[PDB]
């Protein structure tokens, strides 16, 4: 597909960021190497349900004023295709794919087979969680729903499973064109407080590293690669100074198209035609 | 001519704050006596300026 880092990155690092800041313990965990009252007044101060102030993330270039105390700004950098396919083909398909998602489903039983339902079609399955059927189990698939032979499996009629697949979004035919690029986004946790914007850091490293085992950067966006900057002053004459330490993300990913084929072809025919001369 | 001429401000003076970490040298961002400032203000005078 076309992809926009800076979104993913975003999307990705606020819910995470607001669930590590609502768990004591895992910041007294990160924090560790810090002093003492670093550490404490930190955690007293924008950690936990009851925390007073609150950290923040979004994109550079606003028209209004931010949460200089703690905030996150983003900024899309640089990038560079690397890779290039023979034909400039990624790959090819018989039937147009959508995302890969995971779902949680529970098995039921129907006219003697078990069948997990998925909220979407699916275009591929990858992994029934736990799972793995022999030939007698005559799995199958259809539609929406993974259907599954119940005689021998009555003890798992309502097992609860966890379902890794695909979208379908149509039949039809085509090719993947496309290329690999190399691309920057920085991230800078700017704080008026220095040991707020050091804590800042290490909570973002520790959400990147988290972060690397997602699905999303785990099909896409591969090969994570960190840079960090100095810590400065980001703003030096207001009243105070704004001080921050800038990352850079980097990340290796594919840009698409499908290219759908029309052409089809069903019969051959053959025919003999005499040359007389 | 300057109680004429100047405005009434309420003046407060500036002290470092004890909050500040004895190590790193920084504030303590949950202060109460200073909101993260490192600097806590004395109760307030009234002046002309
Ligand atoms: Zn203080």
């Not at chain 1, 209004?64 to 560079?80: P, R, S, V």
Request: proline share 3%; with cysteine; glycine share 6%.
């Amino acid at each position: 597909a076309i992809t926009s880092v800076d979104s993913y990155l975003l999307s990705e690092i606020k819910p995470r960021l607001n669930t590590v800041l609502e768990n004591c313990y895992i910041i007294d965990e990160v924090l560790k190497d810090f002093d003492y009252q670093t550490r404490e007044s930190f955690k007293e101060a924008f950690c936990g349900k009851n925390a007073q102030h609150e950290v923040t993330v979004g994109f550079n270039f606003p028209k209004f004023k931010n949460n200089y105390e703690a905030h996150y700004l983003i900024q899309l950098g640089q990038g560079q295709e690397t890779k290039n396919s023979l034909g400039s083909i990624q790959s090819s398909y018989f039937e147009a794919t959508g995302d890969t998602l995971v779902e949680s489903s529970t098995a039921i039983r129907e006219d003697d087979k078990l069948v997990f339902t998925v909220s979407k079609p699916i275009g591929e399955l990858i992994k029934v969680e736990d799972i793995e059927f022999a030939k007698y189990d005559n799995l199958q698939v259809e539609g929406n729903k993974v259907s599954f032979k119940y005689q021998t499996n009555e003890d798992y009629e309502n097992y609860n499973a966890n379902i890794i697949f695909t979208e379908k979004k149509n039949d039809s035919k085509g090719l993947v064109k496309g290329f690999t690029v190399e691309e920057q986004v920085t991230v800078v946790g700017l704080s008026f407080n220095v040991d707020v914007a050091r804590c800042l850091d290490a909570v973002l490293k520790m959400i990147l590293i988290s972060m690397r085992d997602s699905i999303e950067e785990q099909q896409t966006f591969q090969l994570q690669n960190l840079s960090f900057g100095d810590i400065a002053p980001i703003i030096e004459d207001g009243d105070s100074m704004i001080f921050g330490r800038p990352t850079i993300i980097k990340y290796t990913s594919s840009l698409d198209l499908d290219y759908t084929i029309t052409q089809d072809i069903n019969k051959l025919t053959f025919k003999e035609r005499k040359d007389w001369k | 001519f300057i109680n004429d001429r100047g405005i009434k401000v309420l003046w407060e003076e500036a002290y470092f704050c004890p909050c500040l970490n004895p190590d790193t040298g920084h504030p303590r961002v949950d202060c109460p006596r200073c909101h993260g400032k490192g600097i806590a203000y004395l109760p307030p005078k009234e002046t002309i300026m």
